[PDB]
Design an enzyme around this catalytic site. Sequence first.
Site, PDB file in Angstrom:
ATOM      1  N   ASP A   7       0.857  -1.193   0.000  1.00  0.00           N
ATOM      2  CA  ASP A   7       0.000   0.000   0.000  1.00  0.00           C
ATOM      3  C   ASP A   7       0.889   1.237   0.000  1.00  0.00           C
ATOM      4  OD1 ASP A   7      -1.915   1.880   0.289  1.00  0.00           O
ATOM      5  OD2 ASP A   7      -2.425   1.375   2.365  1.00  0.00           O
ATOM      6  N   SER A  45      -0.791  15.741 -11.892  1.00  0.00           N
ATOM      7  CA  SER A  45      -1.028  15.374 -13.289  1.00  0.00           C
ATOM      8  C   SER A  45      -1.298  16.625 -14.130  1.00  0.00           C
ATOM      9  CB  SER A  45      -2.237  14.421 -13.388  1.00  0.00           C
ATOM     10  OG  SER A  45      -2.637  14.183 -14.686  1.00  0.00           O
TER      11      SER A  45
END
Length: 330
Positions: free
Chosen positions: A35, A199
């Site tokens: 994770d 992004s």
Amino acid sequence: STGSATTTPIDSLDDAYITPVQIGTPAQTLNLDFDTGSSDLWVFSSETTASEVDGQTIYTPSKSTTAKLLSGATWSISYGDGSSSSGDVYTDTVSVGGLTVTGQAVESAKKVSSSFTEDSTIDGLLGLAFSTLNTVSPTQQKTFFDNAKASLDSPVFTADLGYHAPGTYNFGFIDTTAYTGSITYTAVSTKQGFWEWTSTGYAVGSGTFKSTSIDGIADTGTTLLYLPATVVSAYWAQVSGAKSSSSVGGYVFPCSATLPSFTFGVGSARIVIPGDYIDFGPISTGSSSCFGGIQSSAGIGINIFGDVALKAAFVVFNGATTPTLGFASK
Ligand code: NA
């Protein structure tokens, strides 16, 4: 040193991925969920409340000649999905894919929430976010990656998740055969303890690319792609009969649909998520309503590039003094 381990989807939907991990001496192999959005290595154990264990493999520290109680230390964690676990702590030897760390904090669960008990395939979590998020008190502990780092050939690990197929976690090296083209690196903020990046925009299907900054985290422990409501509405508007269902808890679509791709930007590069990756199947067994793999982040307080996005790429988690993320097509 390096390590290389195969990671395998737990079910036919790629809800999560498990990776075998050796703990203790002689080795006890547990299948952990790696994770990148958390920083605790915790396991089902001989200490876990018996009614909360249903099929998981447990760690038994009393059977490990290298286990030592980390006296006084406790831990307690809550995840973004409402699940939780807590317990005490041992140090032990932990190996992943041939890479060994001695003195790793292994957090032994005394209690786990119902979602953990109900998932017999996941024996615990191995956190790979920054060690500033580790929940051990009163002495915070390091992740497996942070403890391994100085021994590694290069201070990196890579995630290469499969679509309906096994993939790979590598530590300490880039496998130049595992991707196509070049790797595009992008800046990371560690201010919130995550692999947080920005992004450069998105496209829906064959549509034009929208240049827009989207801050979010690279999180292998989250199944879906969580993005701002504007972006998510623009995606699902291209699917006839798709709608947001308050009763189901997100966007659903007709199972008869063909889904468009979704592209996200990494600097001037582009990662394309095929439409098929965004289908999470019937909402309930036999339903003709299917659950979407792109969902709104509104109310979660952060955008999350979870497995839907990450499995479309070869992802480099660069833990050098100035951390960065890298993405390549594959
Ligand atoms: Na679900």
